[PDB]
């Protein structure tokens, strides 16, 4: 009974789907087996997303998977709102109640929010790439207006890779007007890297200063580059390499060659493939639940044309919207839930501080307890030497 | 000659339209003429803008025209930039360079940095709706950096028309906190409406208040309603009707019957619809 | 209307009480909404037994 299926991978992101053929090694069933439509096209060009798209209707493919650009956020959810096509991503959240929208990110917005209010901050700068959204921006900036915060954001993302350097040292300087000595980082981890590396050649990883980067995977940074530059960072993680699901993840993950699964000899991983792996097992098992409700669904390419003039879905696939929604399974991130607009939800999101020797949980995050610390001080390693001013 | 040509057209922008086959008529050639495909989708399904767009396309349309949602801009960017195909518009310029995108309304921003350079505000908030694009706010914060303003802007377009009441009366008691004497507006027509009627209700028309609405529209808007309230208020005006050529399409404005040409039949007229005619 | 809160601003006055037919009332309050002065530090009577049947 196998069962076909979309595959929207963007080029690059050959760890992704490495791990895609691992989730398809992990829950393979006799019930039934995935039917991938695998396509390497550019997340940025809704033109070709909608003719890869259009492609698998023409397959009629029972479910979809990929990526989608903050361009093409309102191509997949306008073309899953009218289609009534079930999809899943494990991109950045939409802003809005978008029905046949599955995705694998719990909003990383309260935790921040939670996280400011932990360390009292009043002042501080605000880098934002444009591409994951500004969602958090206006968010930030909402709970500012409330605290009396002073937000300093800036678009940091439309500069040019060619001078990547020179707009940098205007730019601290900037901050060097205010002397902030507070700056939330909201970029991809190249562009973090990339600017944590100016920000060495500048020589503010030194301490005193406070650091934050807002992503899923705080530990896929190099952060051993600043580890003993003095200054205080911290991020959120959803994925704890301590558990031991995941550490016998790691027991199959690393020992693989990485010529047939790139991106997977390695002791680390982005937490982008741990959500894909996690989509897997969720897909998979959703499935194994309509074998139980043997609701029968089988079609050709009845789909045709995604150009029909109305187009008429076919309305099994809107049940297969709730048999998804309801399923609640344990994944790589831990639990997974979702409320009827698809959205995750009672997942955790474990908190993360950069000691000395590396970098360390402090405790986790809930949406409905909030913030929550852990006892783990590991009875205090040192008082640092104070410094003392005269 | 006949000429095919696309004519996407948001419904309720009737104006636009009435104003659209006026620019038919009084520009027609006797060396050829244009061939309009009319077509009155709803631009917030970015699908059936592709929709119409493939049917334009299926037309062989020379050309295509309309208005485009920020949540269908990167559709017909994408589209337009594909198949090389010219698509001038009316709507908010593209916050990126593409080819083929003619667009008929000048970027506003610039302006409005010099302006608050004139009046020489410190801080002040600015409110702002999301369907116009966020990206005026963003030049506001950059120069918030060079400037040092403390700007505190909030959305407004999230609320429901339904409960659209006492979320305005919270939020501008949230600017009393702030004790805020000056706010940028930076909303839709309707929106700048209902504000400043909400405004009117709270009483903050008064003197000691100022305020600046972001947006061409600023002779369009009814601000009658606040002539006297004694705050200041200035704006924003892309088209002089001391214009001889301005005076001139008013004296036959006012002369169409509104069943043929619903809306025209007014002293002025709506700065989109000035942009489609002379598009 | 506008000439006459006018000349009540020279006396500066903050205390009025209207006494009018409910019609002239609502004009009046209109008038009242439209210049503005209905801001905290102002005050009003209205002298009728309408003072519910008019809108407030
Ligand atoms: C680790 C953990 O707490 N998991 C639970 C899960 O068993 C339950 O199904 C879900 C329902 O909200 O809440 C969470």
């Known amino acids: 009974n196998s069962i076909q299926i979309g595959g929207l991978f963007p080029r690059g992101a050959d760890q992704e789907y490495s791990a895609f053929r691992v989730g398809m090694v992990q829950f393979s069933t006799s019930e039934f087996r995935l039917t991938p439509h695998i396509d390497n096209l550019e997340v940025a060009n809704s033109f070709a997303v909608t003719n890869a798209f259009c492609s698998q209707f023409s397959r009629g493919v029972y479910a979809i998977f990929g990526f989608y650009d903050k361009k093409s956020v309102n191509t997949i959810t306008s073309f899953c709102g009218t289609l009534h096509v079930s999809f899943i991503?494990?991109?950045?959240?939409?802003?809005?109640?978008?029905?046949?929208?599955?995705?694998?990110?719990?909003?990383?917005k309260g935790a921040l929010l939670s996280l400011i209010e932990?360390?009292?901050?009043?002042?501080?700068?605000?880098?934002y790439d444009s591409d994951r959204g500004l969602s958090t921006l206006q968010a930030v900036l909402d709970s500012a207006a409330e605290k009396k915060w002073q937000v300093t954001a800036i678009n940091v993302g439309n500069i040019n890779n060619d001078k990547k350097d020179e707009t940098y040292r205007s730019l601290f300087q900037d901050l060097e007007l205010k002397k902030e000595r507070r700056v939330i980082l909201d970029c991809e981890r190249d562009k973090v890297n990339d600017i944590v590396d100016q920000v060495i050649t500048i020589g503010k990883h030194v301490k005193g200063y406070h650091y934050i980067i807002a992503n899923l995977g705080?530990?896929?940074?190099?952060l051993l580059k600043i580890q003993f530059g003095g200054?205080?960072?911290?991020?959120?993680?959803?994925?704890?390499?301590?558990?031991?699901?995941?550490?016998?993840?790691?027991?199959?993950?690393?020992?693989?060659?990485?010529?047939?699964?790139?991106?997977?000899?390695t002791a680390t991983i982005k937490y982008t493939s741990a959500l894909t792996y996690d989509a897997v097992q969720v897909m998979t098992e959703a499935f194994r639940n309509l074998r139980k409700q043997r609701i029968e669904i089988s079609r050709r390419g009845n789909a045709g044309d995604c150009l029909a003039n109305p187009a008429v879905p076919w309305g099994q696939g809107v049940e297969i919207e709730r048999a998804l929604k309801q399923v609640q399974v344990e994944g790589l991130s831990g639990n997974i839930k979702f409320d009827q607009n698809g959205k995750?939800?009672?997942?955790?999101?474990?908190?993360?501080?950069?000691?000395?020797?590396?970098?360390?949980?402090?405790?986790?995050?809930?949406?409905?307890?909030?913030?929550?610390?852990?006892?783990?001080?590991?009875?205090?390693?040192?008082?640092?030497?104070?410094v003392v001013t005269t």
């Open 118 to 127: 932990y360390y009292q901050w009043d002042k501080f700068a605000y880098l």
């Open 344 to 386: 995750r939800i009672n997942y955790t999101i474990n908190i993360m501080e950069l000691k000395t020797n590396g970098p360390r949980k402090i405790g986790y995050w809930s949406e409905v307890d909030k913030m929550v610390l852990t006892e783990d001080d590991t009875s205090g390693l040192e008082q640092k030497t104070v």
């Open 218 to 222: 705080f530990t896929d940074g190099d």
């Open 231 to 265: 200054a205080e960072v911290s991020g959120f993680q959803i994925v704890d390499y301590d558990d031991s699901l995941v550490s016998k993840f790691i027991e199959r993950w690393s020992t693989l060659e990485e010529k047939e699964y790139p991106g997977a000899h």
């Open 89 to 108: 991503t494990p991109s950045f959240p939409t802003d809005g109640t978008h029905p046949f929208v599955i995705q694998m990110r719990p909003d990383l």
